[PDB]
């Protein structure tokens, strides 16, 4: 189900997903100097029923001192959330790349990646993208 690796993280390029396939997990992590609330949740899970998909376990933090069938959307930011998000994607996930600010794309093809399943191992197709300043 889950992909045992992250996207290839092309240098000078970031990535994001338009929608998250059911089964995606978002770790509940907070800034420095803040901690996950006690008795809180470790991750949010994208679940769904015959007509809906939502996230399961709302995150929290405290001081340390249109829809698409079968997909969730971006969960809203929560207070004192970390600067980045950790996702645990599943096979059939599509992630699009984009050159970081200040760069430009030296190609005309699609900057897309997909988590495939073959021979018991899952890894993402190498994007055909190059970023140059």
């Amino acid at each position, epitope marked *: 189900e889950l992909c045992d690796d992250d996207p290839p993280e092309i240098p000078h390029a970031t990535f994001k997903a338009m929608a998250y396939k059911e089964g995606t997990m978002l770790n509940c992590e907070c800034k420095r100097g803040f901690r996950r609330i006690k008795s809180g949740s470790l991750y949010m899970l994208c679940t769904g029923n015959s*007509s809906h*998909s939502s996230w399961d376990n709302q995150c929290q933090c405290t001081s340390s001192a249109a829809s698409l*069938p*079968g997909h969730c959307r971006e969960p809203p930011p929560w207070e004192n959330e970390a600067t980045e998000r950790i996702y645990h994607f599943v096979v*059939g996930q*599509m992630v699009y790349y984009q050159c970081v600010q200040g760069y430009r794309a030296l190609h005309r093809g*699609p900057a897309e990646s997909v988590c495939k399943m073959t021979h018991g191992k899952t890894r993402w197709t190498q994007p055909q993208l190059i970023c140059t300043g």
Partner: antibody, heavy 119, light 107 residues
Framework: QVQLHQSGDDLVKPGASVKLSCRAS????????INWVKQRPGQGLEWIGR????????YYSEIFKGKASLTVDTSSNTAYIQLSSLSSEDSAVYFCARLLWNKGAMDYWGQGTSVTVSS | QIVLSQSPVILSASPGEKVTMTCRASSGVSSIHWYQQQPGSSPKPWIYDTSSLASGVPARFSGSGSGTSYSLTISRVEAEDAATYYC?????????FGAGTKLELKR
């Protein structure tokens, strides 16, 4: 077994409006989406819109925005689609369908409702 | 919106022959569904998720593909297979169908 049954073949004049129905059976009506599809003679299928009976949620295709409207009557678990400003190109077979959510497919279809317009 | 193109438009295969059909997406999609519509009848689910042979379907059909190229294959044609097959995607809104590829028997 699930079953969807639609109205019979309807013939109407150009410029008028008509309502096509698709009564559901064999499953909970408000727990699933109902999709509408169009098939002009020898031209392939064409998705129209979505409607959830129990939540009053409606989505449309950019092509059909305003040319069709989806309504529901939860008392008799029947779905409706109303077509307005009918023209010569609107003659086709219309299917109601049920959305398999986790797969993003259609798992049950109606028998089709032919509609033709002529002078 | 994604455009799916199926070729060949009309395919003629002798019974017992192994044949393949292709649906090609303008932009990559996660999976493709397939339907079979006999004349004067509604479409019938055939292959979900490009590999999940739909329940009640003969085991002679199989599908596989990835990215922007997918294919529906028949191990051996039979009389019941005279119909048209449509590929579908819902990786983005709105969902789209192919133009259809008819199946005919040789003589």
């Amino acid at each position: 077994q699930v079953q969807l049954h639609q109205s019979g073949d309807d013939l109407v004049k150009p410029g008028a409006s008509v309502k096509l129905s698709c009564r559901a059976s064999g499953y909970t009506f408000t727990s699933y989406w109902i999709n509408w599809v169009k098939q002009r003679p020898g031209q392939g299928l064409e998705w129209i819109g979505r409607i959830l009976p129990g939540t009053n949620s409606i989505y449309y295709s950019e092509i059909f925005k305003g040319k069709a409207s989806l309504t529901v009557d939860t008392s008799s678990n029947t779905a409706y689609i109303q077509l307005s400003s009918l023209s010569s190109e609107d003659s086709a077979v219309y299917f109601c369908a049920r959305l398999l959510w986790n797969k993003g497919a259609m798992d049950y279809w109606g028998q089709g409702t032919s509609v033709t317009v002529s002078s | 919106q994604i455009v799916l193109s199926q070729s060949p438009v009309i395919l003629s295969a002798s019974p017992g022959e192994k044949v393949t059909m292709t649906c090609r997406a303008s932009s990559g999609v996660s999976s493709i569904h397939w339907y079979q519509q006999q004349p004067g009848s509604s479409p019938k689910p055939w292959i979900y998720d490009t590999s999940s042979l739909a329940s009640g379907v003969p085991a002679r059909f199989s599908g596989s593909g990835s990215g922007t190229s997918y294919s529906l294959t028949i191990s051996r044609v039979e009389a019941e297979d005279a119909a048209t097959y449509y590929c579908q995607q819902w990786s983005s809104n709105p969902p789209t169908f192919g133009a259809g590829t008819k199946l005919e028997l040789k003589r």
